[PDB]
Design a protein around this ligand. Structure first.
Ligand SMILES: C[C@H](CC(=O)O)CC(=O)Nc1nccs1
Lengths: 237, 300
């Protein structure tokens, strides 16, 4: 059934699973027209498909051409997402296919279930967790590949860099969701925290800076402070 | 006009014959039902006074044989039986008519209700949904499960309605996932009408039989089937103009006949609100929408 805080450790067991987040699939800017009407302009999007145990991220770039001449784009985007996740599963060797796919938004359940009819033993589940995967486009290297794309493309990343050499998956996921929540809540301040110190760099082959164990503790504290700070600003507390 | 005689009535029981019903007292001199209109299927149904558990009954057509009811004190129910000796069947019935021990099927002449509820229902199709080939009549009760219910347990005692499942490979062509899920026309017209039922009349017949089993026995799987068959049509963008015309008449008389006090359990809010107000066919069911809004405005 649904995935929540009671079964949170299930994310890090040895059953292959993927999170699918469709927030950034259909992305638009809204603007006035010459006649004073309003029009949307789509920009490139992405499906965020993540293995929370290993950090493997399957980033399918959704190029604006897929919307050309299509109607009801917000509805179509869910079905396109499900089509692409199903195609990914079919592309994976049997021993790599997930046993569960957890969608971050309940409107993805029926599209994904219908596209995965051929896989009756893959469970399609919602979650009660509020996950900040919409902020993936605040990770500079992910945003850059999406916006530079001129055609549909799949790009593979490890969203944990090399952290699993030193920490468990549970801790890596907790660090990831804290970083993404902070970038979602105050992007400018989060990036300031992550880069403020020029002597800590992002390796060419990484997404995040090369912090020591002690520096990650400091960074995580500053991210928690940011989130609390913004909550106080928001609610006047 | 034909006659369903009763050897006796040893236990107090409410007897239904189609949409009519009457109460028989324990050991009352009741010996059956006369003047049953030829040309339709019929259903004779029972609810025991001392145990309202198991509504049960028999679908039959007097054109196919001579049928009588005898209470079985071992199995504790009124059983339908076929009399193969015609001359004896006429004489015992005659005697019971002469002694005026039969109720008359109380049909008003202006009244087309039963025809309107059974227009497409044929005995031969009932006997394929309800499988007991040694009898010409079909037993149904409140607790019988459907084949689809059993898939989600005695297969001999099941209702073999046609399985409808909107999230199944049968309903969804590979490569047409969104199309077929949002517009069930493929599933309705190719899989169900052209493929399985062969024509709209057989589809309607099963829909009407499902409703009648839901209404007369409180059979829950029959209610599920009735709503699924409605939903499949209403959720199709492309339906032969005439078929929605006929759907509206069928549903109007079903809603008209439903007991007002059973609406909470016999009507699915989601299906009806979707069919009348959101579906492709939201504007094609004018008569049904009008009776639903005037009779059950709470459901909506
Ligand atoms: C005892 C009898 C045995 C037989 O005829 O094979 C069956 C019987 O009584 N049938 C009825 N027909 C009309 C009213 S009751």
């Amino acid at each position: 059934g649904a995935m929540n805080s009671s079964n949170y450790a299930e994310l890090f067991n040895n059953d292959i699973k993927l999170f699918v987040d469709d927030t950034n699939v259909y992305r638009v800017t809204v603007h006035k027209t010459f006649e004073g009407n309003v029009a949307t302009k789509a920009i490139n999007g992405c499906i965020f498909t993540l293995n929370p145990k290993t950090g493997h991220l399957f980033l399918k770039i959704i190029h604006t051409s897929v919307w050309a001449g299509q109607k009801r784009l917000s509805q179509l985007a869910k079905w396109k997402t499900a089509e692409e996740v199903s195609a990914l599963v079919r592309s994976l060797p049997k021993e790599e296919q997930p046993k569960q796919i957890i969608v971050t938004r309940k409107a993805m359940l029926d599209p994904l279930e219908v596209h995965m009819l051929d896989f009756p033993n893959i469970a399609i589940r919602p979650t009660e967790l509020r996950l900040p995967f919409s902020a993936a486009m605040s990770i500079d290297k992910l945003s850059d590949v999406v916006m530079k794309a001129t055609e549909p493309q799949m790009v593979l990343f490890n969203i944990y860099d090399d952290w699993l050499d030193r920490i468990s998956s549970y801790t890596a996921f907790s660090r990831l969701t804290l970083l993404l929540r902070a970038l979602k809540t105050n992007e400018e301040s989060a990036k300031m925290i992550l880069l403020s110190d020029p002597t800590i760099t992002i390796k060419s082959y990484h997404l995040w800076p090369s912090f020591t164990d002690e520096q990650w503790i400091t960074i995580e504290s500053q991210m928690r402070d940011l989130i609390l700070t913004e909550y106080g600003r928001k609610y006047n507390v | 006009m034909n006659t369903v005689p009763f050897t006796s009535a040893p236990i107090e029981v409410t007897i239904g014959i189609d949409q009519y019903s009457f109460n028989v007292k324990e050991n009352q001199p009741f010996h059956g039902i006369k003047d049953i209109p030829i040309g339709h299927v019929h259903v004779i149904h029972f609810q025991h006074a001392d145990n309202s558990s198991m509504r049960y009954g028999y679908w039959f057509d007097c054109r196919m044989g001579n049928f009588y009811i005898q209470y079985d004190p071992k199995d504790g129910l009124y059983k339908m039986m076929e009399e193969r000796d015609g001359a004896k069947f006429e004489n015992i019935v005659h005697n019971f008519k002469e002694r005026q021990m039969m109720v008359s099927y109380p049909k008003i002449d202006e009244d087309d209700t039963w025809y309107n509820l059974t227009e497409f229902v044929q005995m031969d199709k009932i006997r394929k949904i309800v499988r007991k080939d040694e009898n010409q009549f079909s037993y149904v009760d409140s607790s019988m499960t459907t084949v689809q219910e059993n898939e989600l347990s005695d297969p001999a005692h099941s209702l073999n309605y046609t399985v409808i499942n909107f999230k199944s490979r049968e309903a969804i062509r590979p490569g047409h996932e969104m199309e077929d899920f949002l517009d069930k026309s493929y599933y309705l017209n190719t899989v169900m009408l052209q493929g399985i039922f062969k024509n709209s009349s057989n589809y309607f017949g099963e829909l009407q039989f499902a409703f009648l089993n839901a209404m007369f026995f409180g059979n829950y799987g029959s209610s599920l089937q009735w709503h699924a068959m409605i939903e499949l049509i209403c959720s199709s963008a492309t339906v032969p103009k005439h078929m929605l015309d006929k759907l509206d008449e069928i549903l109007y008389y079903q809603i008209k006949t439903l007991p007002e006090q059973y609406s909470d359990i016999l009507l699915n809010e989601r299906v009806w609100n979707i069919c009348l107000y959101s579906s492709f066919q939201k504007n094609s069911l004018h008569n049904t929408e009008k009776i639903m809004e005037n009779k059950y405005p709470e459901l909506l």
